[PDB]
Amino acid sequence: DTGCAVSWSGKELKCGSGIFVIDNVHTWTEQYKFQPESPARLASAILNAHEDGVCGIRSTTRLENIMWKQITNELNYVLWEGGHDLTVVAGDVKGVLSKGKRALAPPVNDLKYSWKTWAKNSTFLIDGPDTSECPNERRAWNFLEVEDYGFGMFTTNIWMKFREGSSEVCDHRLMSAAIKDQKAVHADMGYWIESSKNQTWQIEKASLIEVKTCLWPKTHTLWSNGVLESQMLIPKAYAGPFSQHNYRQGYATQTVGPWHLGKLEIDFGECPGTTVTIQEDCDHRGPSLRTTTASGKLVTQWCCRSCTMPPLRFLGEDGCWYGMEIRPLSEKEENMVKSQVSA
Amino acid sequence: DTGCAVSWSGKELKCGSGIFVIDNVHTWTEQYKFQPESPARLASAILNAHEDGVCGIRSTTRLENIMWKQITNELNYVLWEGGHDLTVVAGDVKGVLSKGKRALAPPVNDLKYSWKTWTPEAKNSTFLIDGPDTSECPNERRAWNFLEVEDYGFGMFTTNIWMKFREGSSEVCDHRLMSAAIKDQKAVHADMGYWIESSKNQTWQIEKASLIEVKTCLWPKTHTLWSNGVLESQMLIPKAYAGPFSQHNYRQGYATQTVGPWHLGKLEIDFGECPGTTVTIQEDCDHRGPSLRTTTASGKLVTQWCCRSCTMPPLRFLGEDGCWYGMEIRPLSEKEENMVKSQVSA
C-alpha cells in the first residue's frame, strides 16, 4: 500500500509504503459488493441440499445478505426452467446473525442453460424471523469464501467460492489489525474495535454495524497469548477478538448484553441524566438494562459493585443501555427493559 | 492517521482514517533523531554510575548510538568545569548491539551547568561508550536499556524524539517505536531498524526480512500478531535477537537460526539461490551447524550444496561480504574446515 498519511497526532506528515488499515464502518459503505459464484452451480447446490434435509440459509455477514436478496429472483428462475418444485424466499436480517448447523456442498452434475458464470409448495427460506417450523439446526451457514477483488470506481466487487469443508471461523480475507506506538485496532467490514494505552492496554471504543457469530481468526489477532475467555469484553461467541487488547478493567465478559439490537456503539461514559456510583451494597451482575422504562420515564440513579469509571455503555436506536455490572438504584429491575439475549 | 494509499491491485484509491505502518528501514535520509534529557542530568547520572561501578554504556539501537556521539563533547565540558576527573569516550558499533548487565538511575542531585538545554586530554578515568569488545571494560559492568521515548518533536527538516530515564530494569525493547499490521494475506512487524514481512501461500510463513541493525532486547508481545502456540525453537529470527514471538516468524523445514551470520550487523534475509550455487535435498547429509559463506577466504566459490529436510528455495543471508547460507544447508564440493563460517559463539 503505497501512499501518504497525515497522522493527526497534533502534527506530523509522512509518506511512504506499507499497510494502511481503513475503517469501512464509519463511512456508510456503498463501495463493497458480493458477487456470487455461478447461477447454475448455486441453484444446483441449493436444490441438492434440499433433498438432504437442509431447510435454508443463515447469512454470516450483512454484506452477504445483500447478495442473497439481489440474486433470489434468478435463483427461482433457474429452478423454474428445469421443472423443479422449489421457491427461494429471501428475508432480511433483524438482530444477531445467528448460526446454522449445515453447509452447502459444491454441486456436481449442475445445469447448463446458456452461460456458466454471473409459489410452489416447497420453500427454501433465507434469513428472516426465527421460526420453529424451519429451525436453525437445518440451516446452512458459513459455506462461502473470498476469491478475488474487483474495480468500478464506485464499488469494489468481491468474488465468492464454496468452502472446502465446514469451519466455525470467520473469513480472514476481509479482516485487518494494526498497532502503532500506543494505539491498536481490530478492523473488519462490520467491526471496528479500538484500544489505547493509558498506564494499561484496555479497550477504548467499538462500532458494530452487525453482530456475527463466527470466531475471529487468531492469525489476525494481536497479543493472543495468556487470554482468559472470561475477561473478553466482547464475547468469543460474537466474533470478539481473542486478544488482551479486548479487555477493560473491572468488567468481565458481557454475555447477556444488548446484542439483539444489531447495530451497536460500545463506549465508556454516562448516559444523559444518569449517575453511577461504586458501592459495596449493590447486587451481582445480570442482563443489561435500558435507561428508560417501557412507560417512558428515565431512571436516574445507578450503582455497580466493583466496576471502574467511566461506566460501560451501549448505544443503539432503542436508546442507552448500561453494562452487565451496573444495576439500577431508584427503580426495581422488574419494571425495567432488559436484554432479550437468552442465556 | 488521515490519508490514503494505492493498493497492490494496481489502482485502488480510497481515503479514510486508521493506522498507517510506514517502513523506515528503506526510507533512510535521516527520518528520525534522538534528543537527550539535559546536559546536567546525564552527566550527573554517568558520574554516579561510575562511582557505583559501571564503567561503560551499551547502546540498544543504532539511533541511540548517534545520540551519544553528538553530545559527548558537551558532556565532557560539564564534567571538566565541575572539577571531576572523568572523560566520556564514544565509539562506533560493529555487528550485534551487545547486551549490558547494568543500568543508570534518575539522579536526585544534579551537576553544575549554566544552561538547562543542550588543553591536555588526560583524565585517566574513562567512561567508554560502545566500541570494540574489550576485557578491561566487560559487558557485565555496562549500562544498557535505560532510556525510553517521552514524546515526538517538531521539525520540517526532520523529526525529533525526546527521551527520558526508565523507572526500572527491563529486557524488552521500547514499544513506542514499533508497529505491526496484517491485512488479507500480508502481515508485517516493523520498528526503527527492523522490517519483517510475512505472507500466506497455502500457509502463513515468513517471506522477507531487512535488518539494518541486530539488537538483543525482547520484542514486546503487545505488538505481536499470533502469539499463541509459539515454540521458541521454531522462530526463524531467534528470540535472543529481537525476533517477534509469533507464528508468522516461521518457515517450513527451518528451525531457529541461532548460529547465523549476526556478526555482520546489517542483513537482508530472503529465500533463493545465490548466483553460481545449486542446492539439492538428500537424506545422505550432514546435520546443522554454523552458517557458511559461499565464497572461501581465497575467493574461490563453492558451487554444490546439499540439504537434509529443508524446503526450496533455500534460506539466504545477504551482507557486505556476500552470500551466507542457512544453518541447514551444507557444502558438498569443499570441506567445511576450509570455509569461512559464522563468528557467533556456539
From Swiss-Prot, chain A:
Q: Which cysteine pairs make disulfide bonds?
A: C4-C15, C55-C134, C170-C214, C271-C320, C282-C304, C303-C307
What portion of the full-length protein is represented by this chain?
Answer: 775 to 1126 of 3387
Summary of the function given for this chain in its UniProt record:
Involved in immune evasion, pathogenesis and viral replication. Once cleaved off the polyprotein, is targeted to three destinations: the viral replication cycle, the plasma membrane and the extracellular compartment. Essential for viral replication. Required for formation of the replication complex and recruitment of other non-structural proteins to the ER-derived membrane structures. Excreted as a hexameric lipoparticle that plays a role against host immune response. Antagonizing the complement function. Binds to the host macrophages and dendritic cells. Disrupts the host endothelial glycocalyx layer of host pulmonary microvascular endothelial cells, inducing degradation of sialic acid and shedding of heparan sulfate proteoglycans. NS1 induces expression of sialidases, heparanase, and activates cathepsin L, which activates heparanase via enzymatic cleavage. These effects are probably linked to the endothelial hyperpermeability observed in severe dengue disease.
Classify the protein's membrane topology as the record does: Peripheral membrane protein
Q: Which residues lie on this side of the membrane: Extracellular?
A: 1-343
- Spell out the protein name for this chain: Non-structural protein 1
Q: How is it modified after translation?
A: N-glycosylated. The excreted form is glycosylated and this is required for efficient secretion of the protein from infected cells.
Organism superkingdom? Viruses
